C-alpha cells in the first residue's frame, strides 16, 4: 500500500510536465551539486580539457602567424616559445602553464609581445575555473543531509494511559557521542477530507500538538527520549474507539530537526506511522541501568514493546462518563 | 499602475540625496560582492597587473643599484638575479615567482642580500591577495538568493466559503526534487491610511494571520499547497462587500522563507496581489492523481481556476445575520 | 554623562581582574581573529619565516652528517642535493620546495634515502599551515559585523498621540539596494531600581513590548519605518507626567538584527536614547514621493521632527479622567 | 555521587550494544572531523603516500612495457620520461608532479602518447584529495564549540525573597570583548517519577520558566547578569520546606546558546546543580563600579554569596497564610 513517505525518509511523488525548463539553467550551481558523481567526475574532466585545449590552440596560432615554423633551426632567429613545433608540443606548454607547474624545457623568451598579455588572462581564468570546481567538490562532500543516517526513529507508535488521560506515544534516540545543537520536533497527520459545501481535498495537513504552547518541544537529547501527544478536545483522536480504528485510513509524519555540532549547518530527519503501526495497549522498554558511575544504554530494546491493560474506549466516551459518574 | 513590488520580487523604490558615501568605503567587501560581472573581472584584472607591475619596478631597481646592467658580460661577477637585462626582462620574473610557476631560465643567486627578504614580502602578499580574490568569486558565484528561481508561487487568489466562513487563499508550490528545510511564510498589507488626529501614512503595514497562533504555518512542502486566511472580526477584510472591493486600492505582499538544503544558507521569495488579482466566488483545480504506487503532479492546471456559488454580503453582515436569525 | 551604550555601539564596560587566562589560550582561533590588523601581518611573517627557518637548518644537517662539504668539487661523488654548499644556500631550498615555486637550480638526487622522507613531512606540514592562515585571513576579511555601517537610526525618539492612545515612536532605515533577509527588532530600558526588602540592583534590565505577542516584530525593511510602543498598563512608562520626565535617570536601548543576503550570517546593530532624546509632542516628517513609476526616498528629512499639540498628563490620569467622564 | 552532567559539560552516558556500524561509514567525513589529533595526521600521511605509490607504479610500468629500460644508453631513442631509470626515480616524478613543484631535471617528451592521458588524470585526482584533506583540516580548526571556555557560570545558586515571592537565582557572565550574537537560555529538571498506574520512567525531563512568555529570555549580555524563576503554581517547587530540601534527590540543567560574532555559527553550554548546590536564604554580591566614565567589573566577587534573613515556609503555606489573614 502506497505511504506517499516511505519508512526513511523518501517521498513519492513524481514532479512531471514541466514547460518551462531553462529555470534550471538560471541556477546552475544547485542543479551541480544536485547530480550524482558519476556525472559530475565526467563534468570535471570534459571542462579540464575544454580548457587546455582552447589555450593550446591559440599559442600555436602566434607561433605560427609570426613565422617561427619556416625557421625551426636558424640560431639567428630568436623566437617566442622555445622548443615549440608541433601541434602536440604546444598542447603540453599550456598544461605546463595553466596548472602552474613549469618544468621548463620550454619556456618563454622576451622578444615576443601579445605573449604576455595572453600569459596573463591565461592565469587568471585559470584561478576562476579552479576555484568553481574545488568549491563544487569541497561543497558535494561535506553536506549535513548525511547525519540523518544516525538519528534513529522507532517503530510502531503506542496509545495507553497516564494517570487518568489518553496519549499517544513513541521513542527517539542518536548514535553518536555528538550533540545536536538546539534540536526540535513536530508532527502532522495527512488524511483525504471533503467539505460542508462539496470540496474535496486529496492531502489534507493538519497539525497536532507535542508541546508547542509551553516551550516543551525543544528537547535536550542524550539519552532515547520518549515524545508523547494528549487527546484532549482538540487532537483529531477526539472519538476513536478501539475496534473503529483499523477502518481508517489516515498517516503520521514525524520531523526532527537541529543543527550539526562540528559545522554550522542544519538537518532534517522524517519518518512516517500509517495504520498498522498504530497499537491499542501497549508500552516500551526501559533501557537505562547504573554502573559504577556511568549510565549504559542498551540499544537491544529499543523497538521492544510490551502488553499491559488498557480501557477501550474513545475519549469523549471517557470523559463523558467521568463527569457524569463523578457528579451523580 | 504602480505597485510597489513587482510580479517576480524586484521593488519600485529609488534610494536618493544621501550625504554620506564613506560608508560604502567601509564595508568595501560587500560592495564587491554587489556589483554586476562585467565590473568584477575588471577589476580583478586591474588588481593582477598593479600588483605584479609594482614588484617588477623594484626588482629592476635593485639590479641597477647594484651595478648589474654595466656587467652584462664580465664573467667574474656573480651578480643578483640571472639573466636579468632589461625592463620587460624583469616584469617577467615577478610573474613567474609570484604565481609559483618558476620556469628556471631566470633564477636567484646566492651572494645577493636583501633578495631573500624581498622574496619572503612577496610570498606573503601574493598569498594574501590571492585569498582575498578567489574568496570573492566564490561568494559570489555560491550565493542563495537563485534558488527562489524554482519556487513558484500563483497569480489571482481567490474568495470563497469554507463550511460556514469566508476565507482568502493562494497557491504555492516547487519545482525541484530537493528540500526547504524549515520553511515558513507570511502575509502583510499595504495600504495607505489617515489617523484621527491628522497625521498621514503614506504606506502603513499591516500584518495579516496566515497560522502563526496555532504554528501551523511551518510548512511542509511537497506537494502543492493551498495558505488560507479566515475572516474573523480582526481581519482588515472584516466587512468588505463584492461591489466594494473593486474601488478600494490596498495590496497583499506574500513573504515565504527557508533554508537550501545542500548549503546552509537562508533564501526568501516574494510576490504581490493589488486589486485585480482578488476575484469573488471562485476556487483552484486539484492537480494529484495516483499510478502505481506514484502520486503524481501536473503543473498545467497549477494556475487554473473555476467558479462556483457564493453569497455576495460581507463577513459582518453574515455572522450578524446568522445570529440574529438563530435566535429569533 | 556616562551612558552605558555608546551612540553607535561601543559600550562602556572594562573587563579587570581575571585570574585565569590560560583560557584565552585554549581556542587561540578567536584570538587570532579578534587581533588589529598590525599585529595579525606581524604574526604571519614569523610564523613563516620560522617554518623555513627549521626545515632549512635540518637540510643542512642532513647534508653536513653524511660528508658533502668535504667533498665540494669530486665528480665521483653523487651526493644529494645538488649545488648546495652553505647556510645560506641551504636556506633558500626550503623556501624553494615549500612554496611549490621550484626553479631546479638546486634539484635532489636519487642516492640519498631519507630525503625523500623529508620531503614528504615537509610537503604535509608546509599545506597544513597554509591552510590555517589563509583561512584565518579570509575569514577576517569577510566578517557580517561590518554591515551595521548601513542601518541608520535615528536621533531622539518621540511621544505623542494615536487615536486616543499614547505611544512612543522612533525611526529606522536602511541605505543599500540589498536586502535583510528574517530582520527582527526588541528593545531594553535601563535603570536601577531597590526591592522592598533591601537589595540594590546596580543596572536592571526590564523588557518593553514592540509587537512580540501579534507577530507584528518581523518586518520588511524597504522604505524608512517608524516603530512604535504603545503605554498601557504594563509599559514601564505608566505614569510619567511631562514635568516629571526631565527629573528620571533611565536609558533606553535598542537592537535589531537579521542575516546578510549575499551570505548567510546574522548580524546585529544597537543605539541608545537616554533623557534628553525624549521629545513630548513632536512628530517626524515624511519621506516618500511618487515619481512617473517610482517611489523617491529623500534621506533629507530623516532626522527631522516637528511640533504639535498633546496633553500633558500622565496616561493613567487620562484614562481615569476619560473613564470618570465617559460614566458619569 | 554520579551526577548525569558534569560541572562543566561532559555527560555520564556510555552507548553500549549497537549493531549497525556501517551507519558509521555512510557519512565518513563527520567520523573524520570527530576523531582526535594524532589519529587525523596519520590518515593524513597514509592517505598521501598511498596516492603517490600508487602512480609512481603505473608510472613505471609504462616506462617497462614501452622498452626504455633496454634502451638507457642508447641517443637514437627518444623515449618516454627522461633520466628515469629505476623504482625510486620513477618514484620521485610522481611526486614532483602531483604537488605541482615542477623541478625539472625529469621532464616528459613528446613523442609518448598515453602521457598525456595519464597527465590528466593524475592532475584532477591530486586536485580533489587535495581539497578534501584541506577542507577537513580546515573545518576541524575552526569550529565553534571551543568559544564555550569563555562563557562562566556561577557555583551553588540561592533560593531568597522578591517583594513577597520566593524567588530561585542564580548568575552568568562572560569574559571577551566580543558579543554573542541572539543569545537564550533555558533549564530543565531532571528527576525520576513513578505514574499512578505503575509505569516508571527513570530520568524524566519538565522544563521550568525563566521568562519564555514575555520573551524575557533573549538577554543581552555584557555585565553579569542574574538569571531568577519565580516559583507560583505551576513551578516544580510548588511545596518544598526548607528542611524537606536536603532529602529530595533531583537536579537542574541548565543551557545557554547563541551564534559566535567573527563568523556565524552556533555555540551552546551547560552546567548543572545536584542537591548541596541551593542554598536557602542568601544572596550574591555586587559587582559594578563606575570610574572616570568607564563602568568596571570586577570578577573577584562573582562566585561569592552572603547570607539574610527569609522565612522558612513552602510557597504554598505561604500563600494560604497570607490569603487567610489578609481576609480574616
Ligand atoms: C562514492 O561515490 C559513489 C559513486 C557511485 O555512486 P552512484 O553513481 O550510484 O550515485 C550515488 C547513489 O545514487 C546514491 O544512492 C546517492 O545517495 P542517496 O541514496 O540518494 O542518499 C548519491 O547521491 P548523494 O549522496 O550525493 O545525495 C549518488 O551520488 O562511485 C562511482
Ligand atoms: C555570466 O555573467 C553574465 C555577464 C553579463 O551579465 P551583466 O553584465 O548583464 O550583469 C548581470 C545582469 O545584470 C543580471 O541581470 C544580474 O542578475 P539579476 O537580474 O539582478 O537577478 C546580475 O547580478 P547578480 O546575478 O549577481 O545578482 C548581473 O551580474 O557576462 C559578461
Ligand atoms: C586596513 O587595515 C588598517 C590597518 C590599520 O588598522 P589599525 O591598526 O588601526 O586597527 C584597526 C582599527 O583599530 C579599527 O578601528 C578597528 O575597527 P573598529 O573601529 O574597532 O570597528 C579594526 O578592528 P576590526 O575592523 O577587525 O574590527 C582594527 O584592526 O592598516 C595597517
Ligand atoms: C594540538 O593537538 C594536541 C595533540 C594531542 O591531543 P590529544 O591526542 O590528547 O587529543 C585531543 C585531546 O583528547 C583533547 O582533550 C580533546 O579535546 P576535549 O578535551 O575533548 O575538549 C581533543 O578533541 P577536540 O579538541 O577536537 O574536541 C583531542 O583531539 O597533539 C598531538
Ligand atoms: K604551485
Ligand atoms: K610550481
Ligand atoms: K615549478
Ligand atoms: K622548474
Ligand atoms: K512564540
Ligand atoms: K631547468
Ligand atoms: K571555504
Ligand atoms: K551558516
Ligand atoms: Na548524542
Ligand atoms: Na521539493
Ligand atoms: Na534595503
Ligand atoms: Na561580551
Same mark, same amino acid.
Given at each position: 500500500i502506497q505511504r506517499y513517505v516511505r519508512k526513511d525518509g523518501k517521498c513519492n511523488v513524481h514532479h512531471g510536465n514541466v514547460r518551462e525548463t531553462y529555470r534550471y539553467l538560471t541556477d546552475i550551481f544547485t542543479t551541480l551539486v544536485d547530480l550524482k558523481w558519476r556525472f559530475n567526475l565526467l563534468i570535471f574532466v570534459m571542462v579540464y580539457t575544454v580548457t587546455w585545449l582552447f589555450f593550446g590552440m591559440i599559442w600555436w596560432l602566434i607561433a605560427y602567424i609570426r613565422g617561427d615554423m619556416d625557421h625551426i633551426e636558424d640560431p639567428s632567429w630568436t623566437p617566442c616559445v622555445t622548443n615549440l613545433n608541433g601541434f602536440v608540443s604546444a598542447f603540453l606548454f599550456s598544461i605546463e602553464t595553466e596548472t602552474t607547474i613549469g618544468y621548463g624545457y620550454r619556456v618563454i623568451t622576451d622578444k615576443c609581445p601579445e605573449g604576455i598579455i595572453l600569459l596573463l588572462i591565461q592565469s587568471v581564468l585559470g584561478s576562476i575555473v579552479n576555484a568553481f570546481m574545488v568549491g563544487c567538490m569541497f561543497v558535494k562532500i561535506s553536506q549535513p543531509k548525511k547525519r540523518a543516517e544516525t538519528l534513529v526513529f522507532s517503530t510502531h507508535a503506542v496509545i495507553s494511559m497516564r494517570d487518568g488521560k489518553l496519549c499517544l506515544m513513541f521513542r527517539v534516540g542518536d548514535l553518536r557521542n555528538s550533540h545536536i545543537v538546539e534540536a526540535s520536533i513536530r508532527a502532522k497527520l495527512i488524511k483525504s477530507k471533503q467539505t460542508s459545501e462539496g470540496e474535496f481535498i486529496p492531502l489534507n495537513q493538519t497539525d497536532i500538538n507535542v508541546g508547542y504552547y509551553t516551550g516543551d518541544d525543544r528537547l535536550?537529547? =542524550?539519552?532515547? %527520549?520518549?515524545?508523547?501527544? !494528549?487527546?484532549?478536545?482538540?487532537?483529531?483522536?477526539?472519538?476513536?474507539?478501539?475496534?473503529?480504528?483499523?477502518?481508517?485510513?489516515?498517516?503520521? =509524519?514525524?520531523? %526532527?530537526?537541529?543543527?550539526? !555540532?562540528?559545522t554550522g549547518m542544519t538537518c532534517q530527519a522524517r519518518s512516517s506511522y500509517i495504520t498498522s503501526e498504530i497499537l491499542w495497549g501497549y508500552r516500551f522498554t526501559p533501557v537505562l541501568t547504573l554502573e559504577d558511575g556511568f549510565y549504559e544504554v542498551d540499544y537491544n530494546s529499543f523497538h521492544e514493546t510490551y502488553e499491559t491493560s488498557t480501557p477501550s474506549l474513545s475519549a469523549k466516551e471517557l470523559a463523558e462518563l467521568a463527569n457524569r459518574a463523578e457528579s451523580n
Amino acid at each position: 500500500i502506497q505511504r506517499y513517505v516511505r519508512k526513511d525518509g523518501k517521498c513519492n511523488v513524481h514532479h512531471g510536465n514541466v514547460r518551462e525548463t531553462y529555470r534550471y539553467l538560471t541556477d546552475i550551481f544547485t542543479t551541480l551539486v544536485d547530480l550524482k558523481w558519476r556525472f559530475n567526475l565526467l563534468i570535471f574532466v570534459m571542462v579540464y580539457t575544454v580548457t587546455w585545449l582552447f589555450f593550446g590552440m591559440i599559442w600555436w596560432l602566434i607561433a605560427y602567424i609570426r613565422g617561427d615554423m619556416d625557421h625551426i633551426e636558424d640560431p639567428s632567429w630568436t623566437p617566442c616559445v622555445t622548443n615549440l613545433n608541433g601541434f602536440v608540443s604546444a598542447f603540453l606548454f599550456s598544461i605546463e602553464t595553466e596548472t602552474t607547474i613549469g618544468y621548463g624545457y620550454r619556456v618563454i623568451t622576451d622578444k615576443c609581445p601579445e605573449g604576455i598579455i595572453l600569459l596573463l588572462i591565461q592565469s587568471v581564468l585559470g584561478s576562476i575555473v579552479n576555484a568553481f570546481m574545488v568549491g563544487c567538490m569541497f561543497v558535494k562532500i561535506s553536506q549535513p543531509k548525511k547525519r540523518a543516517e544516525t538519528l534513529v526513529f522507532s517503530t510502531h507508535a503506542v496509545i495507553s494511559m497516564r494517570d487518568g488521560k489518553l496519549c499517544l506515544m513513541f521513542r527517539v534516540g542518536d548514535l553518536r557521542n555528538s550533540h545536536i545543537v538546539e534540536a526540535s520536533i513536530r508532527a502532522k497527520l495527512i488524511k483525504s477530507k471533503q467539505t460542508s459545501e462539496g470540496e474535496f481535498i486529496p492531502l489534507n495537513q493538519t497539525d497536532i500538538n507535542v508541546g508547542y504552547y509551553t516551550g516543551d518541544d525543544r528537547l535536550f537529547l =542524550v539519552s532515547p %527520549l520518549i515524545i508523547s501527544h !494528549e487527546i484532549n478536545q482538540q487532537s483529531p483522536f477526539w472519538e476513536i474507539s478501539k475496534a473503529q480504528l483499523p477502518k481508517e485510513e489516515l498517516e503520521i =509524519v514525524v520531523i %526532527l530537526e537541529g543543527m550539526v !555540532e562540528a559545522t554550522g549547518m542544519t538537518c532534517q530527519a522524517r519518518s512516517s506511522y500509517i495504520t498498522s503501526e498504530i497499537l491499542w495497549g501497549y508500552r516500551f522498554t526501559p533501557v537505562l541501568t547504573l554502573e559504577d558511575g556511568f549510565y549504559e544504554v542498551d540499544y537491544n530494546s529499543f523497538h521492544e514493546t510490551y502488553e499491559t491493560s488498557t480501557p477501550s474506549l474513545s475519549a469523549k466516551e471517557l470523559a463523558e462518563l467521568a463527569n457524569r459518574a463523578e457528579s451523580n
